[PDB]
Amino acid sequence: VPDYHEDIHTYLREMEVKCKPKVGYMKKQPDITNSMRAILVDWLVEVGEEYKLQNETLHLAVNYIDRFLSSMSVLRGKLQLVGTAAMLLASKFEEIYPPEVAEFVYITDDTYTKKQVLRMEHLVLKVLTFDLAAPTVNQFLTQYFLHQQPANCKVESLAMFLGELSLIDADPYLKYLPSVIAGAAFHLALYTVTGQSWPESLIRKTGYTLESLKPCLMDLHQTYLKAPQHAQQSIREKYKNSKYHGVSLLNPPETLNL
Amino acid sequence: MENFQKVEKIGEGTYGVVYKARNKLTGEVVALKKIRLDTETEGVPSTAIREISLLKELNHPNIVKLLDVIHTENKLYLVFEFLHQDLKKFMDASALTGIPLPLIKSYLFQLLQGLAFCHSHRVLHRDLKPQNLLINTEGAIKLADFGLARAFGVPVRTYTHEVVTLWYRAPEILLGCKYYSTAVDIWSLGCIFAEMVTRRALFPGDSEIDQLFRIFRTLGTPDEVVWPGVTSMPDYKPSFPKWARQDFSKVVPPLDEDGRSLLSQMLHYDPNKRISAKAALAHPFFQDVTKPVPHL
Amino acid sequence: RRLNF
Numbered sequence: 150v151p152d153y154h155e156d157i158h159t160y161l162r163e164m165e166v167k168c169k170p171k172v173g174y175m176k177k178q179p180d181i182t183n184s185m186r187a188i189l190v191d192w193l194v195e196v197g198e199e200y201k202l203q204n205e206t207l208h209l210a211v212n213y214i215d216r217f218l219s220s221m222s223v224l225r226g227k228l229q230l231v232g233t234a235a236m237l238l239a240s241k242f243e244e245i246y247p248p249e250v251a252e253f254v255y256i257t258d259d260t261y262t263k264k265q266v267l268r269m270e271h272l273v274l275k276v277l278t279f280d281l282a283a284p285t286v287n288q289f290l291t292q293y294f295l296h297q298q299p300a301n302c303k304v305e306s307l308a309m310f311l312g313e314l315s316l317i318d319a320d321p322y323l324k325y326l327p328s329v330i331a332g333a334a335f336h337l338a339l340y341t342v343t344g345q346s347w348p349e350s351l352i353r354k355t356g357y358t359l360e361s362l363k364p365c366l367m368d369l370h371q372t373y374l375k376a377p378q379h380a381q382q383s384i385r386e387k388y389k390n391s392k393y394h395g396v397s398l399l400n401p402p403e404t405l406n407l
Numbered sequence: 408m409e410n411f412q413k414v415e416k417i418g419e420g421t422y423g424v425v426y427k428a429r430n431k432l433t434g435e436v437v438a439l440k441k442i443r444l445d446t447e448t449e450g451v452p453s454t455a456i457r458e459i460s461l462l463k464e465l466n467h468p469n470i471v472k473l474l475d476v477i478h479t480e481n482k483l484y485l486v487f488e489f490l491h492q493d494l495k496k497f498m499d500a501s502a503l504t505g506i507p508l509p510l511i512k513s514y515l516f517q518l519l520q521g522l523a524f525c526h527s528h529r530v531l532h533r534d535l536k537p538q539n540l541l542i543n544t545e546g547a548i549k550l551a552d553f554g555l556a557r558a559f560g561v562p563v564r565t566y567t568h569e570v571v572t573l574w575y576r577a578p579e580i581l582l583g584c585k586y587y588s589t590a591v592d593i594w595s596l597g598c599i600f601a602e603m604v605t606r607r608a609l610f611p612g613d614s615e616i617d618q619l620f621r622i623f624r625t626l627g628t629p630d631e632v633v634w635p636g637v638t639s640m641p642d643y644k645p646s647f648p649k650w651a652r653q654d655f656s657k658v659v660p661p662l663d664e665d666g667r668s669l670l671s672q673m674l675h676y677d678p679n680k681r682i683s684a685k686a687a688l689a690h691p692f693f694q695d696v697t698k699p700v701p702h703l
Numbered sequence: 704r705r706l707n708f
Contacts (some may be wrong), residue, residue: 282460
C-alpha cells in the first residue's frame with residue numbers, strides 16, 4: 150500500500166481536467182465523422198493485438214488523437230496518419246521497446262511513407278506541446294482495483310473491456326472524465342459478475358456516489374447491451390481470448406437496479 | 408536558436424554532447440542538449456519523449472528545470488538550467504579527504520525531497536546514480552537525467568534485461584520481479600548515501616549474479632522471514648550460498664547510529680517495507696541538517 | 704490496411 154495512492158489519485162484527478170479534449174470538436178470538423186473516428190480506434194485495437202502492445206498505449210493513443218482533432222482540421226485521407234503517429238508516440242511513451250517506425254508504415258499498407266509518419270509525429274508533439282502523460286480510464290481502473298474484496302479476475306477483465314468499448318464512441322463518451330467512466334465500468338463489471346456494488350471505500354476516495362455515476366452507467370449499460378450488434382467488433386474479439394477469462398461472452402444484465 | 412551562443416561542450420549522454428550556452432539577450436547561462444532528429448530512421452527518441460513530458464510536469468527546487476524546447480524541422484533543442492557538475496565528478500575530486508558529513512546529510516535530504524515530489528506525481532526515475540545528480544556551488548543538488556523515467560499511473564513492467572547500471576539496482580529487480588515500485592528509487596539512493604560516506608560504491612558487481620551475491624555478502628541472504636516471497640521469485644535459487652547479516656558498523660563506519668538506522672531502512676530487502684521518501688524525511692537523522700557549500 | 708473513408 151502506497152504512501153501516495155492518495156497523492157497520485159488526487160493528482161491524476163487534477164491532470165484529467167487539464168488533458169480533456171473539447172466536447173464538441175467533431176461537429177466542427179468539415180470532413181470527419183464520429184463513425185470514422187470509430188473505424189479508426191477499432192483498427193487501433195487490432196494494431197495493439199497484432200504487436201502485443203499494452204492496453205495503456207491504446208488508451209494513450211486515443212487521448213492524443215482526440216486532443217489533436219480538437220485544434221486541427223483533418224481530411225478523411227489523413228485521419229489514419231494521425232492515428233498512426235499517435236500510436237507510435239504512445240508506444241514510445243509507454244512500451245519498453247516500441248515497434249520500429251517501418252512496422253507503423255507497414256500496418257497501413259504503405260499508404261503513407263515513413264517520412265510522412267515521422268513528420269506527423271513532430272506535428273502531433275507540437276500541437277500537444279509534448280504533454281503526453283495523460284490520465285486514462287485504464288489508470289483509474291487500476292487504482293480502483295486496489296479496493297476489491299476480494300480481488301476478482303473476471304471483474305478486472307470485464308471492467309477493462311467496458312473501458313475499451315468507451316474509446317470507440319465519441320458519441321457520448323467524450324463528455325465524461327476518465328475517472329467517471331472508470332467508476333461506471335467498475336460498478337457495471339462488479340454488478341455483472343457478483344451482484345455487488347460501487348464500494349463505500351471508493352465513494353469516500355473518489356467522492357463519487359453511485360447516483361452521480363448514473364448517467365455514465367446508463368450509457369455504458371446500453372453500450373454493453375448492444376456490443377454484439379456494434380459496427381466495430383475488434384474489442385469483443387480481443388476480449389474472448391482466455392487471457393481475459395472470456396468475459397465479453399458473459400451475459401450482460403438487462404436491468405441495473407438504480 | 409539564434410539567441411544562444413555556444414560556449415563549450417560539457418559532456419554527453421543520451422541525446423548527444425551537452426553544450427554550455429548563453430542567452431545573448433538576457434545573460435542566462437544554460438545547458439543545451441541537441442538531438443539530430445533525422446527523418447529517415449526512428450524519429451524523436453523516447454528518452455526525449457519521456458524526459459520532456461515528465462520534466463514539464465515536475466517543478467521543484469531539487470529537480471533540474473526544463474526551460475525551453477526548441478523545435479526546428481531537422482533539430483530538437485532542449486534547454487535546461489545549468490549546473491556545473493555531478494556528484495560523481497565531485498566524489499572523485501573529494502576522494503582522499505571525503506565529502507564532509509554535513510554535506511552528505513544535506514544532499515541526501517534534498518534528494519529525498521525531489522524523489523518524494525516525483526513519486527507523489529507518479530514518476531519513477533529508475534536510473535538514479537551519482538552521474539545523474541547535479542550540484543551547484545551554493546550547496547544545492549538536483550535530480551537530473553530523466554530519459555529513463557516512467558509514469559506509473561499504471562504499474563511499470565520490468566525490462567526483461569534492462570539497459571540500466573548495475574551497481575544501484577534493487578535486489579527485487581535482480582530476482583526477476585515483474586514490476587518496479589518506488590522502492591527501487593529508494594534502494595539506489597541508499598547506495599549513493601553509502602558511497603558518499605565510504606568513498607566507494609556499496610555494491611560494485613560485474614554481472615547480475617555477482618551483484619546479488621555482493622548484496623547478500625553484506626546484508627545477508629534473504630529468506631522467507633526477512634522477505635515473504637523471495638523463494639518464489641523467478642530468479643531465486645535454493646543453491647544461493649547462505650551468508651549472515653554483517654553489522655552496519657563495519658559497512659559504514661563513519662556514520663552515527665541515526666545514519667545507520669536510516670541507511671538500513673533504505674536498504675530493506677522487502678520492497679513493501681523499504682522506507683518511502685516521504686517517511687525518510689521524518690527521520691531524526693535530519694534534525695541537524697544545514698546547507699553548507701562544497702569546496703569544488 | 705488502408706482505411707477507406
